[PDB]
Amino acid sequence: KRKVVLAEQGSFYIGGRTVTGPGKFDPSKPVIRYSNEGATFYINQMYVNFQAPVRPRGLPLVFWHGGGLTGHIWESTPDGRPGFQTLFVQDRHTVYTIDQPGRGRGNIPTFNGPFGQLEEESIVNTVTGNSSKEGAWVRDRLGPAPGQFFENSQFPRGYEDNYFKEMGFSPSISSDEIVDAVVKLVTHIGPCVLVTHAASGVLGMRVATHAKNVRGIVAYEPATSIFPKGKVPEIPPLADKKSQIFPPFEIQESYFKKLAKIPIQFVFGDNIPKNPKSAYWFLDWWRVTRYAHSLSLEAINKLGGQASLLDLPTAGLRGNTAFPFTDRNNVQVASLLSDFLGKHGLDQN
Amino acid sequence: KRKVVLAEQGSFYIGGRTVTGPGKFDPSKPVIRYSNEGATFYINQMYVNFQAPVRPRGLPLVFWHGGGLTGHIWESTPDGRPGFQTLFVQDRHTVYTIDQPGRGRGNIPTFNGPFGQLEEESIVNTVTGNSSKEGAWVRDRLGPAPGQFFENSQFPRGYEDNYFKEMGFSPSISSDEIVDAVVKLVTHIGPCVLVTHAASGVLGMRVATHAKNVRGIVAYEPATSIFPKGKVPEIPPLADKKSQIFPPFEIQESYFKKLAKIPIQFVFGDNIPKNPKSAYWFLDWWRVTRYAHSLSLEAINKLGGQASLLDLPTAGLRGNTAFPFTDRNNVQVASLLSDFLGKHGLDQN
Ligand SMILES: CCOC(=O)c1ccccc1S(=O)(=O)NC(=O)Nc1nc(Cl)cc(OC)n1
Ligand SMILES: CCOC(=O)c1ccccc1S(=O)(=O)NC(=O)Nc1nc(Cl)cc(OC)n1
16 A cells, blocks of 8 residues: 555764865855865765654664665655555564765765865766666666566566666765765664665675674675675676676675674576576676675575575566566565565564 | 654656767677767756645645755754654645755766766766855854854754755756756646745746746745846845845746736745844845845735745744754744645645
């Protein structure tokens, strides 16, 4: 249903730091002008929204959007059906949704001058990068080429404009500062579960190594693998003989071992090939990336962990894209998330 | 009272257009690359959130943040008290909150290359501008100089960092394209009331002249005045005898006359000086800007309109900043908005 009853809701800012321009502020001179004189700027802060049900049961959930996205992807699907925010408030969890630093209602650090530049210091790069509709189409596995859909597709076809409009650029904020803001949120909230997506996968793993309050991770289609420092296994190049997946993130073993203390599930949708696919770069990228993640989870398990890989087709769900939580069967995807939380008692007080 | 019962909630993207890079897309090639080759980019779209109560009464309200802000300002106050979104859902109105193009979850049009540049075309300027903590302090009339409060201030003291963290830059998207997005939303919604703030004041007036569905406007501390073309009255410079207020927006009389067909209220807080204040630029700016608005409302009334100026101190509310709807007495401010809606029948079906 669409009905939701909230004991309370709201939003707040957390994290970040300040930087300044030179000189002193004079309230008698024109305030609106091209200058950083006497100016203090808040940068790299994060936006957080929360919705709490009446009588919550179990741990709060923190939904962390993927690369170039915002908390919108947890609010509604492109065709207007309820997102995981509504579904999990109905499932009696308090739900936090974030816009990480650099995205959406999070801070974009720019000043008076060329983008990202505060006098002679470059806070973020002036040159940006960004995905396109065509690139996102194949990245998210709607189909093998733009305009084409896989046979089984759970994408909300007809709502392509709504979907692609939710995506945008990210300034070059360091990943350390993004992780820092979420660590501060986790400290503020208490024991919780991180639910991550694509680019935020590796970031949530890092947060968990810095914050014991992270009691579980569910990562949809994580984009970068993580390994103990020096211990990255052999990972093959892509079928084009030339490209590689994202360089795996390496952390000190004492931090990596903290991942063995909590339940971790990685979730993949459909249409990731089992064999090399030289004609379709992003399908082959997903094949090797998923392979790397299987090795990462094995390394966590070998250290005593509780890490698992869930392929949605093996659970009877066919046709999911890389955004299973906004696909047409997102209610069944949510059911599998509820199952994970129930298995580990994360839905009990 | 923090509880809210929602018949439905969600979010969506509306408006915008597309721009394209050179050439064609090949799915065999590396997709993550420094290139706009074959790229279609969605630009200048707007984010929209809605919450609908059970059995709504009257017209939906569209809350439109001021300059450099987002829909956060209607969700919560900096100290975590309920914003107008919650208060007006409780008051039985469906509530829309937007992040306009270029702000928050709205689109920031940038690509692969220097900020805002698509190959040789400048979609928005690479050089940005932004407010500082110090400039915003005096702009919002927390006090006469940064760090100092008016004795009577309604600002939630102690939550300064939270407040200033909600503010940011806006890329140089044309005002025409911002107005266009909101006109499209109003067409989608049907009859509605615009609630604007500061920079969005003039934009909401423009929307109403294009969209008969706007049935009322309440503008908090509007920043730019509006007049019929060629009929701008004499407006003095500031007390420094150098500076001017924002050049008034001029529109054809045929469009201006549409403003006389709906109830319009401009709402101002406290601590705007009656007399020239050369020592405090932004206090003097507000004095002359409020004067210009008084003449704008007079012009609407001479065309048969019903346009009023509400100074909160005359209603018994003292110390309000330029964000009365997040101040400590925001419940009393909300009551005055409910009074306006009820008097004009905008709270009945
Ligand atoms: C659902 C959001 O997708 C992701 O998080 C994601 C997934 C796989 C690989 C990279 C990313 S990413 O965002 O961290 N990075 C990109 O998607 N970058 C990127 N994507 C495309 Cl399609 C083109 C491009 O060109 C610069 N750059
Ligand atoms: C409450 C949000 O405030 C407004 O909407 C507002 C109000 C009055 C004047 C200008 C703006 S504005 O945003 O459209 N513009 C600015 O506030 N710009 C701005 N403010 C400051 Cl204090 C400094 C500055 O330097 C470029 N530039």
